[PDB]
Amino acid sequence: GPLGSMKMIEVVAAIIERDGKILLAQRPAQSDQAGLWEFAGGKVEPDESQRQALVRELREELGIEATVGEYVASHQREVSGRIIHLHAWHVPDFHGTLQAHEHQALVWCSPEEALQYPLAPADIPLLEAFMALRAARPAD
Template structure:
C-alpha cells in the first residue's frame, strides 16, 4: 500500500530517476534510452546492465492504472513486467509481477529459479520502496490543476504568450489550487479566468506530472456548461480545438507533452461513443 492517490502513485512509478537510483544499490544500472528526464511514456526504451549482461525493454503502457514493459533484447527469451495500481480509499494498492523465460545454461532450471528469482524479488522490493517514498512526498504538496476540455471530440489547447522561453508553446488551461479551494473549484475558476467560460468537471485523466517547482500537476476532464460558448485567449496568445490526430503536431510544453498518449486515448474513446461531427 502507498499512502497517496492513484494518479500520484502512477506518476512516481513512471519517474525515470527514481527507478535508476533504486536499482543502482543492487548493482543494476538502468537508464532511459528514449525517455524524457521526468516521466516514461509508451514506446520509451530502457537499458539495464546486470553484471556482464544488458537487457533492453520497451514501455507498452504508462498511466494511472499502472505500467508495463516487454523485452526488446537481452539474454532472456522473453520478459514481461507489469505493475498494476488500484485505489483503495485514500491509498493505492500496488501489485507487481514479472514473467520471463530464459535459455537454460550450465546451472539448469534450478539455477534459473534460485538466482533469477532472488534478483527479481530484490529488484521489485527496491523499486517499490523508491516509488512509495516519492509518491508519499508528492502527496503532501500543493497541487496545480490542468483541464482537458472536450467538445465534439476535440481538445481545447491554449498557446502561451509569455515568458519568452515558453512563448508560442501549447498547454492545457489551469493553475494552482488556492487555500480553501477544492480541485474542482480551482478548475472552474482557472477556466473562467483564462478562457472566459464556465466548465463542469467530469473526471480525472492520466497520472500526475511533476513540475519544476516540485508541485504535482493533476489533470481533470471537463465540459463547457454552455456548449455554444466560445473560449477566448484572455491570458494567452491563442486557443484552438485539436482532434486526436492533431495533438502531436502542436509544440506542447514538456509537462503537457508527457500526457499526450492519455489525451489521445481519451479523445479516441469519446469519439467511439459519440463520433465527432
C-alpha cells in the same frame, strides 16, 4: 525520509473536448517566441477544490464556467526541489464562450494532432493518456 520537507505545487489542467477536439491555448513563460500551446487551467490553492480551481480559472482565463467530471491523468514534475502535481481532467461541459485572457491564441485540435505540436513538457504525458483513454478505452 523527507516527506514534509518537500512541498507540492498543485496545478490543474482542463481538457476541454468539444466536437472531438481539445482546446489549446498559446502561452509560454519567459520565451520571447510563440507557437507553443498549453492546456488551460491553473495552480490550486489548498483552500480551494481541484474542480473548483479549474472552474474558476477557466472562468477567469477562458471566460467559461466549466463542468468538471471525468479525470484523465495526473503527472508529477519538479520545479527546483518543489514537486508540481498536474491533474489533466476532462470537462465534458462548459457554460459560456471560450476566450483567451492571459493567452494569445485558442485552437481546437484532435488529441493525436495535439501531441504533434510544441506542448509543454508536462502536457505531453497528460495528453498521451487522454488519447490512450479514447483509443484503449478504460471501459472494457
